[PDB]
Design a protein around this ligand. Sequence first.
Ligand SMILES: *C(=O)/C=C/c1ccc(O)cc1
Length: 125
Amino acid sequence: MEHVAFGSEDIENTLAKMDDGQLDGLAFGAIQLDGDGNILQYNAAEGDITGRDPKQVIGKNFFKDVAPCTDSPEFYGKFKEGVASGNLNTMFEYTFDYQMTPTKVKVHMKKALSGDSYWVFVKRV
Ligand SMILES: *C(=O)/C=C/c1ccc(O)cc1
């Protein structure tokens, strides 16, 4: 594995510029989105939680295409407010339920260190 804990205070420094292969070594799901919600990175742990194939979802829009159940004030709303402000660091539980067995997760969205990039970290609860 890669030795990084969900919710660590400096997680954006540790994961910075991690390539796809190292991201697959994390204990929790990790998605990287651009400012519009398009998927830039998506690791194996997340695919194990949600059933999505990490290589097929890259390039899709998370909120419009892959995860409509997050198209809501409580998830996408928080994401888009953080993007617009250039600051994002929010943790909350949520239920993923689009075309899947409803799965309760803890979500941590945090602005990446690099440019037009935002992390969505996920673990089961
Ligand atoms: C609800 O539509 C959520 C769907 C979803 C969440 C997270 C993923 O990695 C994939 C699909």
